[PDB]
Structures are given as C-alpha cells and as structure tokens.
Amino acid sequence: GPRALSRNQPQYPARAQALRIEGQVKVKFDVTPDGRVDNVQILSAKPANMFEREVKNAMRRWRYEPGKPGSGIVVNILFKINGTTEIQ
Amino acid sequence: ASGPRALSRNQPQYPARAQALRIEGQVKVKFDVTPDGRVDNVQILSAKPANMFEREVKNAMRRWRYEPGKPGSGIVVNILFKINGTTEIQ
Predict the structure, then answer these.
(1) Which CATH number applies to A1-88: 3.40.605.10, 3.40.640.10, 3.30.2420.10, 3.90.550.10?
(2) Does A87 sit within 8 Å of B9, measured CB to CB?
(3) Residue B10: which of B60, B68, B53, B57 has the closest Cα?
(4) Which of A76, A77, A82 is opposite residue B84, by nearest beta carbon?
(5) How far is CA B59 from CA A47, A50, A57, B40, B55, in A?
(6) B87–A81: do the CB atoms touch at under 8 Å?
(7) Hey, are the CB atoms on B87 and A79 less than 8 Å from each other?
(8) Measured between CB atoms, which of B12, B22, B80 is closest to A81?
(9) Assuming Cys at both sites, which of A26, A68, B21, B65 could form a disulfide with B7, CB separation 3.0 to 4.6 Å?
(10) Across the interface, do A77 and B88 touch by the CB < 8 Å criterion?
(11) Which residues lie closer than 8 Å to B20 by C-beta, 6 or more apart?
C-alpha cells in the first residue's frame, strides 16, 4: 500500500552528538490519503528524553504518494555514533 | 611538483577499543620512501590520545606503496580518527 516519496532523516540532537550518545526510536503512524503522516506515537525511545522531538520533527516532513493510505505502520529510527578515518 | 608519489594508501582501521570508547584522535607521522616504493623510518611526531592509534597507523602505512625509483625523506602525513553521529530509518 503506502508509497514513500520523501523521508527526511532526523537531525541528530546536538547534545547527544556532543556526548556521543546513541539511540533508537520505534514509532507507529498512519499515512493519510493526502500523503501525510498522522497519529504518530512513540512506541519506545532508548535512551528516552533525547531523540523524540527530532524524530517527530522529521516525520512531519515526510511525504507519501496521495491516494494510497495505510494505518499502524511502524518504523525504527537509529541514531548511530561511528568512527571513520582520514588520511590528510 | 616533486618527490615521491603514492600508488596506494590503505586507510587505517579504527581500533576496536577506540570505537568502543567513542573516542577521536590524531596521529602525525614523518617517514621515508625507499627506492622500492616502501614506507620506512616511520616517526610518530604526535599521537593524541596516547597509546590508542599508533599501532593501526603503523600497520596501515606498511601497506602503502609509492612509485619505485623515486625515494625521498621526511614526508609528513596527518591521520584523523573522527567520530560523527549518523541516522537510519528502518
């Protein structure tokens, strides 16, 4: 059913980035026939009180094809800290 | 411009311990290039934090390959170990 057109990545909260805190947020939502996200609910957020606002802010930006609704869709959003190298 | 030119420069592995501790670092190296195109006389000029990145830097630089027949001395490179946050939608 629902077909995503744009799913903006959330901003990594600056505090969490500075502290090198990883997280996971599991979210349930509906896709309306207008192609918008609706009825967003945070199923779990670990650690909590850190990533939820940026997750909800990103999901308001998401767009799906109109005329193809669906309800009770679950996504998992991962906030990852990773090490990379550079030869200068 | 002049001097030894690299054919291959292997990126160092991020040490597991450093990944686990989510720490960054920097290593500055001075080295020579032999006629066979190998790195030699590796000198660590700075390594911060200490006792974390030196081994993986050295192990990578022994893999590097330069043009043969064009030796040189005193080449300097800076190696960064960077931590950044990324996101994934699943």
Answers:
(1) 3.30.2420.10
(2) yes
(3) B60
(4) A82
(5) 37, 39, 44, 12, 6
(6) no
(7) yes
(8) B22
(9) B65
(10) yes
(11) none
